[PDB]
Each structure stands twice: as C-alpha cells, then as structure tokens.
Design a protein around this ligand. Structure first.
Ligand SMILES: Nc1nc2c(ncn2[C@@H]2O[C@H](COP(=O)(O)OP(=O)(O)O)[C@@H](O)[C@H]2O)c(=O)[nH]1
Ligand SMILES: Nc1nc2c(ncn2[C@@H]2O[C@H](COP(=O)(O)OP(=O)(O)O)[C@@H](O)[C@H]2O)c(=O)[nH]1
Ligand SMILES: Nc1nc2c(ncn2[C@@H]2O[C@H](COP(=O)(O)OP(=O)(O)O)[C@@H](O)[C@H]2O)c(=O)[nH]1
Ligand SMILES: Nc1nc2c(ncn2[C@@H]2O[C@H](COP(=O)(O)OP(=O)(O)O)[C@@H](O)[C@H]2O)c(=O)[nH]1
Lengths: 153, 149, 152, 149
C-alpha cells in the first residue's frame, strides 16, 4: 500500500528542501519532486505541489504537509487563507495535517506557538493535526513530523 | 481496565487545551475523554454530594507559568487536595503550561515555589509544556505510563 | 546482584535532591542509602570519624560526582577531590558519572566549561560521562542513569 | 565484518577528542574499533607516500570547527575535492559541526548553508551539532551512520 502525501505551502517556504531532506533522514530507509519515502515497512508517496478535467492533488490523500516560512510575518495571513480553503474540501475530510514551521534557524522568526495561535490550530475539530518546528538546512525536526504521521496511519 | 485521571487547575491554566492536545499526541491512539496509549486506557476528567476524586489514579495539575499572582493560590489547592483520602495513593503530574510565553516562571522556579522536592508520600513529575503545540505533553504521559502498577 | 554506586560532591551540590529524584524518574521502578531499580538491574546508592575504614570505594562500580554549576569559588576544590579519588587503586574499574547540577540558575558554568576546567577529556583509564541536570525537575538524570546502565 | 570510517578535518577541529568521546558514548560498547550493538566500525583519525583513502571506506566524518570562520572556505574546498574521488562514491558523509559550546560560533544552519550541503546530489549526508568536550550530539551522528548501513 502507498500512502498519498502532498506537500503544500507558498513559494520559498522550504518544500523542495524538506522533501530532499526526508531522504537523508535517520528514520527513512536509504535510497539512490515525487518521491517514495519508506519508513520501516511503510511506503509514502509524496507529491511536492488547465486542460485537465480534474484537480488530482486532494484525491485519496492521507496527509497534507503544510510548509510555513517562520520568518515571513506578512505572508502568514495568505498561508492561513489557503489552509482553510483547503480544509473546506470534502476530499480531505479524513486527512491528517502536519504543519512544518520551517526556517526556525533564523533569528527573530515567529515561534511555533505564535504560528499555532495565528493559524487557530487548536480550534480545528475534525482533523488530526500536528505542528512541528524545523530547519530544512539541517533536517532538525523532520523526524518528529514523520513519526507523528506514522502514529496516525 | 480504565485508569482514572483528573485534570485540575485554575481558570485559564490550559486544562481544555491540554486534554484536546492529548488526542493529537504521537503516543496516543487516534470534559471526559478516553485516551489510549498502547494498550492502556485512561479516562480523563477535566475538572471545570458527589466527588470527582473517587478512584483517581493520577492527578494532573496545570499551572499557568505566566501567572505569578496566583501560583500561591495553586500551591494551597495542591496541598489541600493531596490531603484528601481519595487522593493519598495518587501519582502527581504537574504541567508547567504556557512555557512559550516570554518572561514566564521557569519550571525550576515553579518546582521550588511549590516545594515539590519536599513531597514524601506521592510519586510526582513536573513537566514544561506548551499546549498550543503539544510540546512537553508526550513526556508527561510517558511518566504516567511508567507509574502504572 | 547489587551494583554499588556512591554519590559524592561538596555540601550544597545537590546530592540529597538527586538521589530523591532518582525515585521519581521515568526509567526507575516505582518503590541516604537507597536501592534504585532500572529494568532488572539493582543499584545500591550511598550518598556520602570513628570508623577504621573508608568503605566508600570498596567494590564500588560507579562514582556519581555532583557539581554545583553555580559554584565558581569552589570548583577547584571539586577538581582536587576528583583527582585524589581517582588516584585510588580501589576505584581502578569504576565508571565516573558527573552531574553538572543547578543548570537552571542563570549565569552558571556551562557543562563544557566544567568539563574543560576538570580536564575530563584527559582521563585515560576510566569510562566517564558528564551530564547537565536540574535536581528540582529531574531533567538530565535519566540520561545519566542510562549511561551507567550502558556501562554495566 | 569491519565497517571502515575515516575522520577528517583541519588541525584543531576536534578529531582526536571526538574519537576519544566515541569510546565514552552511551550507544558504544565499553585508530580505534568502535562497536555499536552488533556492528563493528574501524575508525581512523587522519592526521603519506603511497597512501590514499583505504579501500571500502564506508563513511567519511568531517569535523568542522564551528568557531573557525576564517577557514570554513578551506574546509568547503577540501570537502568537495573529497566528494569528487571515485573511490568515495558509495561513502556516507557525516559532518560534525563541533565546538557548538563556544559563544558566537557559526550555527549548524549557517554551516550547512555555507557548505551548500543541500545541493549534494550523489551522497547520503547528515550534519550534526556537537560538543566534543561533553559528547553531546555524537550519539545522534553515530545513530545516523547506523541507519545508513
Ligand atoms: N535559513 C533557512 N533557509 C531555508 C530553510 N529551508 C529552506 N531554505 C532555503 O529557502 C529557499 C527556498 O527553499 P525551497 O525548498 O526551494 O522552497 P520551496 O519554494 O517551498 O520549494 C532555498 O534557498 C532554501 O535553501 C531553513 O530551514 N532555513
Ligand atoms: N500562549 C499559550 N496559550 C495557551 C497555552 N495553553 C492554553 N492556552 C490558551 O489559554 C486560554 C485558556 O486555555 P484553556 O484550555 O481554555 O484553559 P482552562 O480554563 O484551564 O480550561 C486559551 O485561550 C488557550 O488557547 C499555552 O501553552 N500557551
Ligand atoms: N536552583 C537549584 N537548586 C537546587 C538544585 N538541586 C538542589 N538544589 C537545592 O540546593 C540545596 C542543597 O541541595 P542538597 O540536595 O540538600 O545538597 P547536598 O548537600 O549535596 O546533599 C537545596 O536547597 C536544594 O533544594 C538545582 O538543580 N537547582
Ligand atoms: N570548546 C571546545 N573545545 C574543543 C571541542 N572539541 C575539541 N576541543 C578542543 O580543541 C583542541 C583541539 O582538539 P583536537 O581533538 O585535538 O583537534 P584535532 O587537531 O582535530 O585532532 C583541544 O584543546 C580540545 O580540547 C569542543 O567541542 N568545544
């Protein structure tokens, strides 16, 4: 079984770097923007996100990973708008939500608690969710996010 | 077999948020909530002729680490509660909540003020946490697991 | 089989509080001379005139040295006692665990500063580990106990 | 089966101290052989005629002095020169950002960015903050190596 995971977030958030770092992660099996990521016996198929009749992103999707640039205080309102537009889709009713508060290495960034509060994460009533501080330049924090998704299978 | 836990603290401490976050925690299987960890079932009561204290195995005390004015109030209630006959064998887990807030009391400051290292008749653990993110909550739950009979 | 551990350090370092907190630690089974059980392993821990003998080093498997991180005035005394102790042939096979205690207090010596002052990386004939800790919360104590377990 | 490992870096980086501390590490059983669980590593702290990277080098550990802003460019050049060697094509790369205890040192993220680590295409790599005076961070570096066998 392949478990479908999509990676969303605004440009420059760290989506490419995060998916790349997943392959280097200690809990992820070694392997030589659509990557199969294997943890123990579990296979995830991860997608880093006109003539098509269909938007295919949300279909059969088990986890959405939202990447947030923690340094960007102005665009966070845009991330929030997109988060809630996305959560309004019936396709995602069963999906777990993992939020990466990325670029936590940068001084004066928003704290993970400030991000949780602004995004009103504790008001979410119909989805499992987890917010995780991370730095995609080092992979710090990514293992914890992946292990949370594993616990939600 | 259900293991009874009561969650107590002053208003605005974080009780509702902590119990909600338990449901989202990595160690937990997906006012009164069943929380399952591995094969262990906890029945957790958020407090706020009957007594909620009956058959309690764990007391979780939530402390707002920013509330310097009312930590004296929490201390008095803590020790008043520890003297109840229903609670004499109970494990005590103290969450020093709102640790994300700048200039809050530190967990060591809270331990020292509450005189926790002077407790003689109860297993206890104090744990820094932030209920907005669930950080610290896993460690608190894991400590309770290790105190199961 | 009891594994003998001694807890040493200057007055006010935190020896009493640490031994107390061992009883509350997640890795320790719920239960100044105390039996501490971790999984199946039993440690007999002693927190240290008319006696003919120094009995503290006899058959001692681990020495826990508790250092007050805030105490810059007496760190040289800790160092002297550490090396006098380590010169004892009785302790030739003992593992050394150093708790850099009171890490919660602002402007305390860092664990690296303590290690450098104590010249710990110059130790040639003993297994050793230094661990930051706060005895008021038990933070750091688990890591210290796990290191001893790994040295059995 | 011995898994061969070389430890490299400029003078004063912390190579001697790190290899020393591996033998004191919790995950390690009590030029050196380091055993983790059932796995034997043979580790050479590099620093001659007819000498080169010993055959079947499985891991390269690069030690970076985090305080050394002047010479991090020197280290970057040596790193990529090493990564160009055909006989190191299958090698895992573990970078220890050492001396993280020293105030105002480069952060691990600054080091990763300067070394352009996330642009590496042909190797498994991990960067790990550490302090060789205490051993902090060494365990995680060793564990990453174990996961790459
Ligand atoms: N300082 C810092 N930079 C990062 C981090 N994650 C990614 N970046 C950088 O931010 C830029 C955008 O990253 P990228 O992964 O391409 O973002 P994407 O547009 O969401 O796919 C690149 O220069 C990355 O190196 C981080 O955690 N900290
Ligand atoms: N900044 C911060 N706010 C928190 C934390 N935990 C809870 N809160 C907020 O504090 C307020 C009271 O929390 P709540 O769970 O309702 O407290 P209760 O009265 O004890 O049940 C709410 O607005 C929460 O979102 C925390 O760790 N940090
Ligand atoms: N702030 C702080 N105080 C501590 C810590 N550990 C112990 N203490 C306090 O230090 C004092 C001496 O501790 P004690 O355990 O009696 O030291 P002993 O003389 O070595 O046995 C007591 O007031 C303890 O509560 C700590 O980690 N931080
Ligand atoms: N402050 C600090 N000093 C360190 C650290 N690691 C090593 N050193 C010291 O730096 C010096 C050089 O270390 P060494 O292991 O001999 O480096 P080598 O030349 O690469 O083998 C010695 O004095 C060590 O004690 C560290 O993490 N922090």
């Amino acid at each position: 079984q392949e478990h479908k995971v999509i990676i969303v977030g605004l440009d420059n958030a760290g989506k490419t770097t995060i998916l790349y770092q997943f392959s280097m992660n200690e809990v992820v099996h070694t392997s030589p923007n659509v990557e199969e990521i294997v943890i123990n016996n579990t296979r995830f198929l991860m997608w880093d996100i006109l003539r098509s009749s269909w938007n295919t992103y949300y279909t059969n999707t088990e986890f959405v990973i939202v990447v947030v640039d923690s340094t960007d205080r102005e665009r966070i309102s845009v991330t929030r708008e997109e988060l809630y537009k996305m959560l309004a889709h019936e396709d995602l009713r069963k999906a777990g939500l993992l939020i990466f508060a990325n670029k936590q290495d940068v001084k004066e960034c928003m704290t993970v608690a400030e991000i949780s509060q602004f995004l009103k994460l504790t008001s979410i009533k119909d989805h499992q969710w987890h917010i995780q501080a991370c730095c995609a330049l080092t992979g710090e924090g990514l293992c914890q996010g992946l292990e949370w998704m594993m616990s939600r299978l």
